[PDB]
Amino acid sequence: LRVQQVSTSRGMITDRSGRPLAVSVPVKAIWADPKEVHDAGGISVGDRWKALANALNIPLDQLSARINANPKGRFIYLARQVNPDMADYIKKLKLPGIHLREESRRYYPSGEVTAHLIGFTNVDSQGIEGVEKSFDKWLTGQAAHNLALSIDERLQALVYRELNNAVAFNKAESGSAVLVDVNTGEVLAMANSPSYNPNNLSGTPKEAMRNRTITDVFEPGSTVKPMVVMTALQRGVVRENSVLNTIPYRINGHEIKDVARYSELTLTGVLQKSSNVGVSKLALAMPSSALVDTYSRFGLGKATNLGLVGERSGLYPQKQRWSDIERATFSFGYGLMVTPLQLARVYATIGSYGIYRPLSITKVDPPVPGERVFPESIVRTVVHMMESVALPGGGGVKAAIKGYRIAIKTGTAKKVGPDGRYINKYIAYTAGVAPASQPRFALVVVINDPQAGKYYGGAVSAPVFGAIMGGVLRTMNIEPDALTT
């Protein structure tokens, strides 16, 4: 006869290098056998029995009422996480029913730096959120196992240090950032702000406990424009040397206007100035299924398959009929909703020059055989085109790193509101790859609703990119690609 459901230790979570991210700490817990007292021990008062309740700081009247609450049970928790020096005194009191049992509570050395991804456990050491829940059966002993994540705590800590201070400085509602290795699909960083300290889950609002990298969905905005140009090159609408007439016009009665008045722009200049008129005239010159297909090939609308709780696949339009105004707006954001993790996998394919690799939060044994979803030559051309964004004249010139070549694309989305209409709050986007000569990392920096002054990604989310991606290349010892080194 067994009256105990779980009575064993649990595993340990580390990063890809072996640094502790989630360690079990052994703690003693006082329990009692209520059937032992009533059947043969006999419920008594006075003696040292009263001092036993006086040591637990529980009144002897109600402590005796909790054990006597059921004369048939064989287990009852008197206290939790008792220290050894005082628990050894309770065992030395020789109680005819009280026993000691070695349990374990969790400690996370990263703390709030990896909180949304690591997660936590309940008082009985059962995973609830994040990696703790997704790999509970693996970590739980009954068959104890360890686990090594794909996160690099060196890069993870520097992404949080800049993303957390960016949300605070701009007084933004939220802020997410995802870093993924280009040619392996391994998630290196995954930070959110504001966060919580999983070592103490007291008064932490559940609104700040959601993994916004996989939960929040937003219209990607201008960040999908590289795929608009990449599709326009394969469909033969234009060539790399084409010049588009970017004069504002009206599709289906609604005005299509750029950020500024540009009479004509280069194909490279469209991604530079983020011309909605340029991408709209390209989308209208193609079948509507072209952009719907290419977006899917890069992972949009598809599941990320990480196994994390609350992981959304985003809203993706499957319409069979498209209005000309809906085809044009679909080129620069309107129409679909994707998580920051899905947007990172898009640029994880852009960096791979058209290779779609699955996302994994565990250390992968190389090599990772992906699947070529787009011609390598076209992506190489557009990736070099995206470098103009981080050069004088582009939108993400504030994201430029001193001594490196990067290819990025800024964005600014209008938040759809509670009643379905667009609000005056914006989503600042900045996503790109680096090094531009040989891509190795893909980064996405998205912050929710800036209120400090500016709101577009090129002025709010872009300087976060250059500060983060700057530290990523220094830590990984990547050779500079700048003309002036």
Ligand SMILES: *C(=O)[C@@H](NC(=O)/C(=N\O[C@@H](COc1ccc(C(=N)N[C@@H]2CCCNC2)cc1)C(=O)O)c1csc(N)n1)C(C)(C)NOS(=O)(=O)O
């Ligand atoms: C790309 O996503 C695209 N934005 C949109 O199409 C969407 N909304 O656009 C809103 C306007 O956003 C902006 C307005 C003005 C500026 C700006 N002042 N630019 C600076 C001028 C000075 C020199 N540096 C540049 C920036 C953004 C709106 O319509 O109110 C949209 C798409 S999907 C969705 N839900 N909303 C642009 C505006 C091209 N991205 O611009 S950005 O600079 O790359 O961030």
